[PDB]
């Protein structure tokens, strides 16, 4: 009536009174990554490798107006803005993603609520680009030579 593993823990059982067989899993255990910018009221929260249905039902019952799902997991109190990019970042989440902080300043504020944490893309390096052609312009190549230094 018991199913063990080789380390010696019970992972399943067959019921005596109903003959219904079950597998047991541990309850979910983890920590939360908090991206905190200075002088603000609350962090932005990342639950790694969790869908937001699981988070909003089975973990966190306090209300969260800003939430979305992402490649890293469930992101609370942040805005999905991954089309935007940034070259420097001090809140780096992993796999080429970042958290930016932008206040709704008094020139362009909104009276409705907003999340000042954005979930953006991190790209630290680049190439310089030139407009010239990669093929021969009639036998010759087009290059850019400095005239002053």
């Amino acid at each position: 009536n018991l199913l063990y593993d080789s380390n010696g823990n019970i992972i399943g059982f067959k019921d005596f009174l109903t003959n219904k067989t079950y597998t047991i899993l541990p309850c979910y255990s983890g920590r939360v990554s908090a991206a905190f910018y200075q002088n603000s009221s609350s962090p932005a929260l990342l639950y790694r490798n969790l869908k937001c249905s699981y988070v909003l039902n089975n973990i966190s019952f306090i209300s969260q107006p800003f939430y979305f799902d992402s490649y890293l997991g469930c992101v609370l109190n942040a805005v999905n803005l991954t089309s935007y990019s940034v070259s420097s970042c001090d809140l780096r989440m992993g796999s080429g993603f970042c958290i930016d902080y932008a206040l709704p300043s008094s020139g362009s504020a909104s009276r409705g609520i907003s999340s000042p944490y954005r979930f953006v893309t991190f790209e630290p390096f680049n190439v310089s680009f030139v407009n010239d052609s990669v093929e021969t312009v009639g036998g010759l190549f087009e290059i850019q030579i400095p005239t002053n230094f």
């Binding site: 255990s29 890293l72 992993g94 796999s95 407009n131 010239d132 990669v134």
Partner: protein, 427 residues
Amino acid sequence: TIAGHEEFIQTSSPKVTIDCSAFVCSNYAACHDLLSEYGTFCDNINSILNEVNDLLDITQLQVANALMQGVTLSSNLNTNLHSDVDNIDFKSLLGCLGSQCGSSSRSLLEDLLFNKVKLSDVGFVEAYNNCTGGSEIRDLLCVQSFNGIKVLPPILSETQISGYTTAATVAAMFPPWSAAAGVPFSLNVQYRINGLGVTMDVLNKNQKLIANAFNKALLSIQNGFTATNSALAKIQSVVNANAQALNSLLQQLFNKFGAISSSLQEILSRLDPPEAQVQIDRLINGRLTALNAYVSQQLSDITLIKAGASRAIEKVNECVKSQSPRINFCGNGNHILSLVQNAPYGLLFIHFSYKPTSFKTVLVSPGLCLSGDRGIAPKQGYFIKQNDSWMFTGSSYYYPEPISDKNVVFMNSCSVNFTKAPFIYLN
């Protein structure tokens, strides 16, 4: 002919993070209240591992800076149209480049590399996504992550590093030529083969042979990752060493260390609070000892990984992005050039080499004493006799040619064992 061989250098490792109180005293308030008397034991372990993972992020940024620094590309560059120069095919080496692609691809060399390694930086994310539910019944990584042991992603994606190596590879092929010394790729190949002692007449006459030798060398690279490639073995030893150490750390949660049980549930359902503490204290001491030893081993292995990353940055700067006058640094002598590719936890380098196939036995002289008591010595070559006349030959390809001022170095006197030659006032 032209030979070609591959080389893996490790520049990173999986970034382990450990929840120390959920490893030691998982869920039980008796254990947590006993553990609070060891002071700052879990804070020290968390700070050491955060320091290790910060060093890992710094070396990944140094590698990407070395790959990207100084390269200038044309804005009209589109690797769907341009993947070929001077009869040499680069299509299996390039990812995707251009303003109309979507920068989320690797080359097929990197596809073949990342499809024999399960636990790369994307295999950990997709294995951890399947722990709420098991997705079959159970898996060792989820048993580790429910006990406070988890691998975190690197700060840059592997498709980002694939874009960096694609930019580095295409800066050698197109007309700024910012990594082929400012000249086109086949011309650069010719000047490096000339720099070992092969004359230019041979290299202009055998240009298509050189291009097909390069194509064959690349294709023989491409069908080689087959269960005895030492680069694939060296890559998989990284992943196997990480999985072995994490499983050995998880096996410490089932030792007794001289207590009555390894389980905290079995001790707190059999004994009173004054006597359960004596048993819990032994488990706490054993598990803190095991965490201490794991952190010491991680601290020793980060130094080896930093040494490897410095060696790879030096190889990128002096074998791929330029060509150094250091003999025997990359390759083995008769080295021509290198290319670079993204690999799991490091880089793959492709070194191309000049290689002789047939030989001839020649009699040679190292110096000629001419009349006027002058001497000449040959300049990367030897002097030979052909039809009783002295001639020059280069040292790496047998081809007689007339003695000239571009062949020799002159001296106002001559050595004692220089061969006497009064017949020379030649070209």
